Amino acid sequence: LSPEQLVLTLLEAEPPHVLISRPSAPFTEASMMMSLTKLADKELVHMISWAKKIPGFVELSLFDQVRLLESCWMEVLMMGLMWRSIDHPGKLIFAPDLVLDRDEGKCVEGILEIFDMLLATTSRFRELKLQHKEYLCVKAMILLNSSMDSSRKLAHLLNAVTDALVWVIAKSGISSQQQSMRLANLLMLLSHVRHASNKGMEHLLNMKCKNVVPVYDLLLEMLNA
């Protein structure tokens, strides 16, 4: 499977946008967690479908496929989020009708922190001018690199995508030396996405223990792992 065929396969696998309506009245702590938890749940279902379309994912053992999704689901969600808010500085596009402003994150006890590092990482992506094709690879890599014989298969799958990212970047035309630089700058961002995920899931866990909103089924299973 050539790098371009892998990228084209990922493009096609791009999940459709989950539509959700912004509450009619101004957000409350509950209404918001309500909208974010619902969105996440629905996006998770689409994420599993997306994963089974990632070249060679289904070939891994089920227990592996499980560990990967269990450890990266928030990162993949936030990487998608950030991408959607790319051309909207200061704004976080959780959905076509659910646009959140950095300031609205105050109706929630300690989520503004999350919203800020999300916007920040986004600005970096915008600054670097992340491309759609690069994005598809970075997102697919997040899943495969969350390894946090079958395993050996995993290494080969992750290299395939890396070759794809390299292939895409080369097509930008920039000097070889610069291709290494962009490739590096894009990946260094994975840690930031990783951080937001940790403080994002920790926050979510707290809310549940707080009963600030109902978190069950898929959303819950993923929370505990």
Partner: peptide, 9 residues
């Protein structure tokens, strides 16, 4: 559930 979507869907 997670396993369901993976193997049943």
């Amino acid at each position: 559930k997670l396993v369901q979507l993976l193997t049943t869907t």
